[PDB]
Every structure is written in structure tokens, then in C-alpha cells.
């Protein structure tokens, strides 16, 4: 059965709290990332998803937390739950994103 990798960060507010030290430098604001299922690692711009455990870094100004989530961690339960399967499929179809993936 499925169970989140980090049960402690299953709550949005708990995730948001980790972004206290998040660099103000980055365009991806704490709200966007936390709502996407991410919590800050405390190092650089590294984040991890509470459900799948996957971690993303090196965020570009043009990156949307949800898109990056669905593109790289397409098997993630939280993405499927909040965004749906079609979104995941559409994300992977967008040229710019498809190329990131290679």
C-alpha cells in the first residue's frame, strides 16, 4: 500500500514552515512549492516531496513547481491526487518540458 515517504510533512503548514530559511533570491516562493508538495531541505534550493520522496534542485526563473513535479516525478501520488493523470500527461507533452526530460 501507499504511504507518504515523509509523513511529518503531509500537512501544508508543516511544509511551509521549512521554507523559513528559503533564499529570497529564488522566484519560486514558499507558498507555490509547499502547495506543490515540497518541503525545503535547508541546503541551497533543494526540496523534497513528502509523498514520493523525490527531490528537485536548480530551479530556473520560469519553473512552475507543479509542472516540475509532474514531469520528473510522474508516479507521485500527491500529483495524481491534486492535479490528475491528464495534467501529468499534458506536462510531459509540452515541448520546453519534454526537452528538460530528454
Amino acid at each position: 500500500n501507499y504511504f507518504p515517504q515523509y509523513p511529518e510533512y503531509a500537512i501544508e503548514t508543516a511544509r511551509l514552515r521549512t521554507f523559513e530559511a528559503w533564499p529570497r533570491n529564488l522566484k519560486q516562493k514558499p507558498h507555490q512549492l509547499a502547495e506543490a508538495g515540497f518541503f525545503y531541505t535547508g541546503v541551497g534550493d533543494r526540496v523534497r516531496c513528502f509523498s514520493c520522496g523525490g527531490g528537485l534542485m536548480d530551479w530556473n526563473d520560469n519553473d512552475e513547481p507543479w509542472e516540475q513535479h509532474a514531469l520528473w516525478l510522474s508516479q507521485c501520488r500527491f500529483v495524481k491526487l491534486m492535479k490528475g493523470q491528464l495534467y501529468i500527461d499534458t506536462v510531459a507533452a509540452k515541448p520546453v518540458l519534454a526537452e528538460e526530460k530528454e
Binding site: 514520493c52 534542485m57 520528473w72 516525478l73
Partner: peptide, 8 residues
């Protein structure tokens, strides 16, 4: 973004 960790 690029992943630094992906599930097994």
C-alpha cells in the same frame, strides 16, 4: 529544475 534523488 533537475532531480538530485528519484524513487527506486
Amino acid at each position: 529544475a533537475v532531480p538530485f534523488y528519484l524513487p527506486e
